[model samples]
Target chain A: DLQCLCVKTTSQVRPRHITSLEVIKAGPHCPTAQLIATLKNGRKICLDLQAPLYKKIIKKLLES
Target chain B: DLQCLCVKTTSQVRPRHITSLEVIKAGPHCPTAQLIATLKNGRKICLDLQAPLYKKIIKKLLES
Candidate 1:
């Protein structure tokens, strides 16, 4: 089984500051979906699922 | 100036085959936004901007 990359997460991030974003879905390795954000400053943070931005992202993914 | 990782791209791929997605915006090295999707089989493909799936992914990113 793979390890879950994000065990703890931030509630939000400034979208403009994000250089990239990655979405990892739940699997045997992880308990739930994950969102990893790469900031321009080189910080990689995971977004908490409860975050409004996170919810919006999930919505977007679903619509796609 | 940096080099764009994707000088060429494929139109689309099955979403189920994608393990993760990275969104890279246009910068000095590239002319437009780009999507790099990592597949379950370990292939990373650059999605063409005009792809229908690409458009939806963009919309998702916009919402977040």
Candidate 2:
């Protein structure tokens, strides 16, 4: 999915909204690597950063 | 714990980001009820809905 979703907050402080942000890698049997970014707030934001195609798509959409 | 998460967008005059949201209402034995949202274009948003589990795990991931 190539989408950049933006969320609006009513506060000025960063309280760790994301629980995890993981990057997925490709390989023969590696199954894919995941880098999870867990927010201090207890939410998870997972990202497959290895997918250049997806990243490019998201970047384009975001830039526009 | 209830978890439902969905986020999508690229523009359309929408910016900012989630920072925080919290609603841990239980008692001295409660723990885990925390919410945070941060955003802006340089903006923001946050929501802490009431939990109904683990004293704090009830904080669902979100809705579709």
Candidate 3:
């Protein structure tokens, strides 16, 4: 698990736009993927995975 | 910071299909999250968090 980088609400774009989508697709790459988001409310969001990291993890997941 | 599980393009599928979303949800589990993605252009994207990990990190965070 890595640190959940923070971004202020004032930013034009938010990391969640990209990261949130990343977690949904984490199954094939990470056996048990997790996502960490910090809300302006001082609350944090966590997402857990229920699959295994496929060989594609190193071949297709990080394309962008 | 967890390696933004790398993935290559041109494959039938891609890892970016999943890992990218993982970083978005990292905050609730870990405080500062980072994703290292190697793009086809050889450029890397790093995502940082701006919050603290919640108790749910061990519980709901890893439920999957």
lDDT of each: 0.67, 0.35, 0.33
Q: Candidate 3 residues A1-64, lDDT tens each?
A: 4233322212232333333323322233344444443444565555323433221231222232
Error of 3 at A27 (Å): 9.8
TM-score of each: 0.74, 0.22, 0.23
lDDT of 1 by residue, A1-64 (tens): 6898887898766665666667766657786677787777987999766457864553343333
Which 10 consecutive positions of candidate 1 chain B have the poorest summed lDDT? B55-64
lDDT of 1 by residue, B1-64 (tens): 5477877888667655666677665666666666787877888998876456855554343333
DockQ (C-alpha based) per candidate is 0.26, 0.04, 0.18
Q: What lDDT tens digits, residue by residue, belong to model 3 across residues B1-64?
A: 5433333222222333222323333334433334443333445444323223311222232343
Q: Evaluate model 1: give its lDDT.
A: 0.67
**Candidate 2, backbone clash total:** 39
> Model 3: how far is A43 from its true place, Å?
3.1
lDDT tens per residue, model 2, B1-64: 4432212221222212333333444434434333333332223233434423322322332421
**Which should have the higher TM-score, number 1 or number 2?**
1
* Winner by lDDT: 1
